[PDB]
Design an enzyme around this catalytic site. Sequence first.
Site, PDB file in Angstrom:
ATOM      1  CG  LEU A  14      -2.607  -0.251   0.966  1.00 50.81           C
ATOM      2  CD1 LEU A  14      -2.938  -0.719  -0.395  1.00 50.81           C
ATOM      3  CD2 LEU A  14      -2.884  -1.455   2.385  1.00 50.81           C
ATOM      4  N   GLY A  15       2.254   1.053   0.155  1.00 53.65           N
ATOM      5  CA  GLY A  15       3.217   2.070   0.108  1.00 53.65           C
ATOM      6  C   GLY A  15       4.135   2.269   1.110  1.00 53.65           C
ATOM      7  CD  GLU A  16       8.091   1.538   0.308  1.00 53.53           C
ATOM      8  OE1 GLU A  16       7.001   1.435  -0.126  1.00 53.53           O
ATOM      9  OE2 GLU A  16       9.111   0.599   0.192  1.00 53.53           O
ATOM     10  N   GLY A  17       6.130   4.742   4.246  1.00 50.56           N
ATOM     11  CA  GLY A  17       7.175   3.925   4.464  1.00 50.56           C
ATOM     12  C   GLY A  17       7.852   4.745   5.717  1.00 50.56           C
ATOM     13  CB  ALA A  18       9.627   6.793   6.896  1.00 49.90           C
ATOM     14  CE1 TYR A  19       6.086   5.453   9.838  1.00 48.66           C
ATOM     15  CE2 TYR A  19       7.955   6.902  10.706  1.00 48.66           C
ATOM     16  CZ  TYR A  19       6.608   6.655  10.442  1.00 48.66           C
ATOM     17  OH  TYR A  19       5.798   8.035  10.291  1.00 48.66           O
ATOM     18  CD  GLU A  21       7.302  -3.583   2.683  1.00 51.34           C
ATOM     19  OE1 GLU A  21       6.768  -4.213   1.647  1.00 51.34           O
ATOM     20  OE2 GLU A  21       8.480  -3.954   2.685  1.00 51.34           O
ATOM     21  CE  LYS A  37       4.490   2.399  11.175  1.00 52.68           C
ATOM     22  NZ  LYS A  37       4.486   3.461  12.553  1.00 52.68           N
ATOM     23  CG  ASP A 126       3.748  14.345  12.744  1.00 54.52           C
ATOM     24  OD1 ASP A 126       4.097  13.435  11.783  1.00 54.52           O
ATOM     25  OD2 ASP A 126       3.900  15.467  12.048  1.00 54.52           O
TER      26      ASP A 126
HETATM   27  O1  DF2 Z   1       0.963   4.537   9.306  1.00 54.94           O
HETATM   28  C1  DF2 Z   1       0.232   3.882  10.007  1.00 54.94           C
HETATM   29  C2  DF2 Z   1      -1.194   3.634   9.375  1.00 54.94           C
HETATM   30  O2  DF2 Z   1      -2.161   3.335   9.976  1.00 54.94           O
HETATM   31  C3  DF2 Z   1      -0.538   2.360   8.381  1.00 54.94           C
HETATM   32  N1  DF2 Z   1      -1.049   2.749   6.950  1.00 54.94           N
HETATM   33  C4  DF2 Z   1      -2.352   2.714   6.603  1.00 54.94           C
HETATM   34  N2  DF2 Z   1      -2.934   2.125   7.750  1.00 54.94           N
HETATM   35  C5  DF2 Z   1      -4.237   1.740   7.362  1.00 54.94           C
HETATM   36  N3  DF2 Z   1      -4.773   2.174   6.002  1.00 54.94           N
HETATM   37  C6  DF2 Z   1      -3.856   2.578   5.287  1.00 54.94           C
HETATM   38  N4  DF2 Z   1      -4.650   2.599   3.807  1.00 54.94           N
HETATM   39  C7  DF2 Z   1      -3.446   3.152   3.212  1.00 54.94           C
HETATM   40  C8  DF2 Z   1      -3.496   3.598   1.855  1.00 54.94           C
HETATM   41  C9  DF2 Z   1      -4.673   2.973   1.197  1.00 54.94           C
HETATM   42  C10 DF2 Z   1      -4.660   3.421  -0.195  1.00 54.94           C
HETATM   43  C11 DF2 Z   1      -3.769   3.994  -0.878  1.00 54.94           C
HETATM   44  C12 DF2 Z   1      -2.683   4.577  -0.171  1.00 54.94           C
HETATM   45  C13 DF2 Z   1      -2.446   4.448   1.229  1.00 54.94           C
HETATM   46  C14 DF2 Z   1      -2.341   3.453   4.162  1.00 54.94           C
HETATM   47  C15 DF2 Z   1      -0.948   3.824   3.727  1.00 54.94           C
HETATM   48  C16 DF2 Z   1      -0.081   2.843   3.411  1.00 54.94           C
HETATM   49  C17 DF2 Z   1       1.339   2.950   3.072  1.00 54.94           C
HETATM   50  C18 DF2 Z   1       1.522   4.393   3.374  1.00 54.94           C
HETATM   51  C19 DF2 Z   1       0.636   5.395   3.492  1.00 54.94           C
HETATM   52  C20 DF2 Z   1      -0.638   5.158   3.890  1.00 54.94           C
HETATM   53  C21 DF2 Z   1      -2.683   2.929   5.215  1.00 54.94           C
END
Ligand code: DF2
EC number: 2.7.11.1
Length: 272
Positions: A14-19, A21, A37, A126
């Site tokens: 679903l993407g990065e990241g930093a810490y 993916e 995560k 943040d």
């Molecule tokens: O950081 C703590 C977050 O809870 C973990 N990230 C997510 N958690 C819960 N649901 C999510 N849908 C996403 C997401 C969905 C669709 C497109 C882009 C992103 C992301 C996502 C993941 C990776 C990078 C940025 C955004 C995400």
Amino acid sequence: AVPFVEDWDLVQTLGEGAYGEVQLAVNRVTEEAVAVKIVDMKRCPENIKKEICINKMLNHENVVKFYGHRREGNIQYLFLEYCSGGELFDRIEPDIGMPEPDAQRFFHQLMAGVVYLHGIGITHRDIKPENLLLDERDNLKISDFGLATVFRYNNRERLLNKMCGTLPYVAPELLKRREFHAEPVDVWSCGIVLTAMLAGELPWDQPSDSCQEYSDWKEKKTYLNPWKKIDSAPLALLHKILVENPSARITIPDIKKDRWYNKPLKKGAKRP
Ligand SMILES: OC[C@H](O)CNc1ncnc2[nH]c(-c3ccccc3)c(-c3ccccc3)c12
């Protein structure tokens, strides 16, 4: 009594990241989707042990649900409410923003989450569009408690003393003062988020006297961008939120009494 329903298979990233993916993890029986995560502890487990700990406290509709975690040697896995809409950041058109009624609705939901957090003694620290996720029905969810901390415990407020966050959203007292109250700082960053949503641009790199965009604001030059794009009602809210002295800054209870905040703008759900 429950079948083979908890083997988590990683469909797609679903993407990065930093810490590290984030991955979309489905279970192959229910097709129950969660996000995962993944963090490399090799790449100080206090940043993440606290993140899990704070996450276990949280239970609100505008806050990303925590489902559990995984040790698996040196790699921590955080399992989290999946938000299929992505980031609020991607709904903001550069230089434009978004329709005011959408912005108002996202704002209502952000306040709902921040009130919740502050009620259980947690400050996020943040708040920005990148950390505000959107679910399948475009509901907003506060995400990423990696910088969050307890500012109230046993009915006793603690002052914050370390600087953190992201410079464009950070309130001026955190760069000026040794110690400062947590809640006004959250409120400030919601102000910056509202400005971004209505104008499609951030007012300044940082809220310092060495920053002309910021000095222009203290001087009420609202004929300049981004303030000229805004509209007098939300702008008047923004004048209450973006107040340099944190003791003069409007509180959340008072934001809920604000005129723009209570203006009818948007019709009920597209369906039904
Ligand atoms: O950081 C703590 C977050 O809870 C973990 N990230 C997510 N958690 C819960 N649901 C999510 N849908 C996403 C997401 C969905 C669709 C497109 C882009 C992103 C992301 C996502 C993941 C990776 C990078 C940025 C955004 C995400």
